[PDB]
């Protein structure tokens, strides 16, 4: 992680297996019940988009929900792009560039890149932003798929 309490500069660490393994057991014991969201955020202490992608990937148990979460990530990522016109284009290759949806999501950003955004004047919380989009995906799942009936 890195964006924990921001009291870390270019500093970074790989998600402790303790924490990662914890995510697995969490969804393993509780599935997608409403409590899957809170524990997710807890085991996501301002981490990098990759670390987050790792977590999701770790417990991507069934394509059913993973689809709902995927569709949402994509839509949010695209929305970000809508209001981020790259204002007349990122003319000339060599600039750090404004983070794009696919970049914040991790698909088109390198681990180093993500670090760069998380350690720059003004810090672009790529991981934190992405962590918000994922949660929107999780809570949409939970809503339209979680409990049984009026028991």
């Amino acid at each position, epitope marked *: 992680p890195i964006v924990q309490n921001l009291q870390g500069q270019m500093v970074h660490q790989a998600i402790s297996p303790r924490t990662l393994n914890a995510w697995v057991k969490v969804v393993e014991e509780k599935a997608f019940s409403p409590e899957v969201i809170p524990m997710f955020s807890a085991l996501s202490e301002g981490a990098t988009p990759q670390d987050l992608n790792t977590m999701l990937n770790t417990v991507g148990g069934h394509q059913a929900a993973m689809q709902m979460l995927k569709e949402t990530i*994509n*839509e949010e990522a*695209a929305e970000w792009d*809508r*209001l981020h*016109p790259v204002h007349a284009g990122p003319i000339a290759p060599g600039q750090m560039r404004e983070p794009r*949806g696919s970049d914040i999501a991790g698909t088109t950003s390198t681990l180093q890149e993500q670090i760069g955004w998380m350690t720059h004047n003004p810090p672009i919380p790529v991981g934190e932003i992405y962590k918000r989009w994922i949660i*929107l995906g999780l809570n949409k799942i939970v809503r339209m798929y979680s409990p049984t009936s009026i028991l």
Partner: antibody
Amino acid sequence: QVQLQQPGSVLVRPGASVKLSCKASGYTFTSSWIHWAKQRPGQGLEWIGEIHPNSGNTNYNEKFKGKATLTVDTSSSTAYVDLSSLTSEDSAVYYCARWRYGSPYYFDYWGQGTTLTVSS
Amino acid sequence: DIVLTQSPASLAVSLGQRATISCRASESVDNYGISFMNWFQQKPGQPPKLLIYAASNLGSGVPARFSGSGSGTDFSLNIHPMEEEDTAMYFCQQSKEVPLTFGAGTKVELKR
């Protein structure tokens, strides 16, 4: 029952300015981006711009950049557009539309629109 | 901006038949496997009405009669079966680049 209520009609003389409103109701104003669209009778919809109540971020259409200024008043759930140096051209129906806060993004609610008349 | 060219200015669709209007963007309105081309309808005097979002996703409370299709640069709003009340103006808008743009519209009139 999210209500985007805005003035029926407005008459101003050329060279003046007018601040059109759009008193949002029903939903939590700071959730969605308010957009503004102009449409001259017998014509399509031009995009004036958009603004986000909880941040003041805006995106104006280069065309209107210089004519229209988007504002808001979170306190009283109302978005505004101030049209400068009004001329006969500006006479068109001005709609205010909410951009849904959720994943499926698109214009989900429209105000009935205010008709402007810039005449002598 | 990112221009959208709508095919016919007007189109007379006989009742029960199929109305086909098309919208062509100067650029691909695609992103993350999503064609962000929306279709709206408009009755004289009132504000627009979303029919189809995401190029083919029907909106809420829009009769199945309205269908969407397209990808990247070419899109089409297909009405079938065409019913009387459908006399309206139709526009397509790209929800892809910051300066959202609209089409010049198509006037779908019912051929009686």
